[PDB]
Amino acid sequence: SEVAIKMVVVGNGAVGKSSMIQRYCKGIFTKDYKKTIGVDFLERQIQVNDEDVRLMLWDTAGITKAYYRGAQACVLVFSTTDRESFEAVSSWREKVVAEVGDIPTVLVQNKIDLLDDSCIKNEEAEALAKRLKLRFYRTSVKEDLNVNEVFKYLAEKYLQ
Ligand SMILES: Nc1nc2c(ncn2[C@@H]2O[C@H](COP(=O)(O)OP(=O)(O)NP(=O)(O)O)[C@@H](O)[C@H]2O)c(=O)[nH]1
Ligand SMILES: [Mg+2]
């Protein structure tokens, strides 16, 4: 037997959800932006506590019922250069809780490589994560920076 975990990745359009999943599961950086059509399924096998676990990442455009059904962990994503995507974070957390209840969740500020054009103050983001009682990562899918740690953390939080 091998444990599988269904993970959803949610957040406003263009924050980098598909890119994060394609980086994590296939090791590529998708530079072109196309809004995701339908639901896409990707997976990666990782070892947590020396046991192989299969992460099943569900990707859709930022359907509702089937997408969230059986979700076991969640990545909440906003973008360093998209203020509206940050201001919607609380609303996304309420939406996941309403649909699947209390599951392991992590908060991610993506595109941290564009920090020269940031519209989110470091204290603002860290405060939001504290209020929502969520661990917080700053990632760059483009630079493969902290992407692996986001998903390993969720897998450890689910298995423990
Ligand atoms: N500079 C930079 N661009 C990024 C990063 N991650 C993703 N992008 C870019 O952001 C754009 C949108 O990314 P995408 O993964 O499609 O976003 P999405 O959240 O899946 N959008 P949708 O909800 O419409 O499907 C793409 O041009 C992609 O290359 C990052 O870390 N840095
Ligand atoms: Mg997408």
UniProtKB/Swiss-Prot annotation:
Its cofactor is Mg(2+). A motif (Switch 2) lies at residues 60-73. Its EC number is 3.6.5.2. GTP binds at residues 15-19, 33, 36, 62, 110-111, 113, 140-142. A motif (Switch 1) lies at residues 23-41. Regulated by guanine nucleotide exchange factors (GEFs) which promote the exchange of bound GDP for free GTP. Regulated by GTPase activating proteins (GAPs) which increase the GTP hydrolysis activity. Inhibited by GDP dissociation inhibitors (GDIs). It is found in: Cell membrane; Cytoplasm; Cytoplasmic vesicle, Autophagosome; Endosome membrane. GO terms for cellular component: autophagosome; cell junction; centrosome; ciliary basal body; cilium; cytoplasm; cytosol; endomembrane system. Keywords: Cell membrane, Craniosynostosis, Cytoplasm, Cytoplasmic vesicle, Developmental protein, Disease variant, Endosome, GTP-binding, Hydrolase, Lipoprotein, Magnesium, Membrane, Metal-binding, Methylation, Nucleotide-binding, Phosphoprotein, Prenylation, Protein transport, Transport. GO terms for molecular function: GTP binding; GTPase activity. Mg(2+) binds at residues 18, 36, 59. Transmembrane segments: none annotated. It is a lipid-anchor. It catalyses: GTP + H2O = GDP + phosphate + H(+). It is an enzyme of class 3 (hydrolase). Belongs to the small GTPase superfamily. Rab family. It is linked to Carpenter syndrome 1: A rare autosomal recessive disorder characterized by acrocephaly with variable synostosis of the sagittal, lambdoid, and coronal sutures; peculiar facies; brachydactyly of the hands with syndactyly; preaxial polydactyly and syndactyly of the feet; congenital heart defects; growth retardation; intellectual disability; hypogenitalism; and obesity. In addition, cerebral malformations, oral and dental abnormalities, coxa valga, genu valgum, hydronephrosis, precocious puberty, and hearing loss may be observed. Interacts with SUFU. Switch 1, switch 2 and the interswitch regions are characteristic of Rab GTPases and mediate the interactions with Rab downstream effectors. The switch regions undergo conformational changes upon nucleotide binding which drives interaction with specific sets of effector proteins, with most effectors only binding to GTP-bound Rab. The small GTPases Rab are key regulators of intracellular membrane trafficking, from the formation of transport vesicles to their fusion with membranes. Rabs cycle between an inactive GDP-bound form and an active GTP-bound form that is able to recruit to membranes different set of downstream effectors directly responsible for vesicle formation, movement, tethering and fusion. Together with SUFU, prevents nuclear import of GLI1, and thereby inhibits GLI1 transcription factor activity. Regulates GLI1 in differentiating chondrocytes. This is Ras-related protein Rab-23. It comes from Homo sapiens (Human). The lineage of its organism: Eukaryota, Metazoa, Chordata, Craniata, Vertebrata. The chain holds residues 7 to 171 of 237 of the full protein.
